[model samples]
Target: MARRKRRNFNKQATEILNEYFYSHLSNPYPSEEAKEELAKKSGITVSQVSNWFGNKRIRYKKNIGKFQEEANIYAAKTAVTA
Candidate 1:
């Protein structure tokens, strides 16, 4: 087993990726057309766009899970006092 080095996304790439994330923040899935548009805008291949979105979705899910867990813990603590 080996650990792969994390990628350091360039500032431009990060900005573009973040924009895409925000545009679909409520529903992170990109339509085919949206994917193509992003590919063109980001000067990336469609496959790259798809792969980035796939990874982004996983990362977003993990973050949301963490947030929910923390929120539940906070709610429980507050509930006991109220």
Candidate 2:
């Protein structure tokens, strides 16, 4: 089979992802079930959800201001959902 097409996640997927990431900020490690559910809902794979969190962590930590800003944004999203 050919390599999987590189596709961008839609806004909805990102909304769910960021919400979950922020709500669970106290415990960054999302369980397998959580990841799988996110993937299922987002039309992505479990590993993709896991990698997104990993990338978000690694890429943002290098820039404290940016990371904080995004975390606040995600926190806001979480609050809206709550």
Candidate 3:
């Protein structure tokens, strides 16, 4: 298989990626239209957008799960006290 062309990760692109990742941290699945929009806005290919989201989902799941667990614990304690 041929190697895919590398994408240029500029400052604007990085910022957009960070926002998108955090905005969808709870549910990282994007719609088809969203994929197209992101690709157009970022000036990157749709495949690259998909690949980036795939990798981000792995990392986000680990980190967000921990945060959710902590929040659940705190909420339980608060409810018990209330």
RMSD of each: 11.5, 3.3, 10.3
TM-scores for all predictions: 0.50, 0.66, 0.51
Task: Mark the 10 consecutive residues where model 2 has the least summed lDDT.
Answer: 1-10
- Summarize candidate 2's per-residue lDDT along 1-82 as a digit string, tens digits: 4775436556666777776876665566567997777777777778788766665666656886976777777777664532
lDDT of each: 0.58, 0.69, 0.58
Tell me how far the alpha carbon of residue 50 in candidate 3 is from the true structure, in angstroms, after superposition: 1.8
Model 2: CA > 4 A from native: 1-8, 23-28, 79-82
Clashes of each: 0, 0, 0
Residue lDDT tens for model 3, 5-82: 444545544445545655565666555876676667666666766677676668656788764654454444432211
Maximum-lDDT candidate:
2
lDDT of 1 by residue, 1-82 (tens): 3675435344545446545554555665667876676666666666666667667667767788764554454444432211
**Top TM-score prediction, candidate number:** 2
Q: What is the total number of backbone clashes in candidate 1?
A: 0
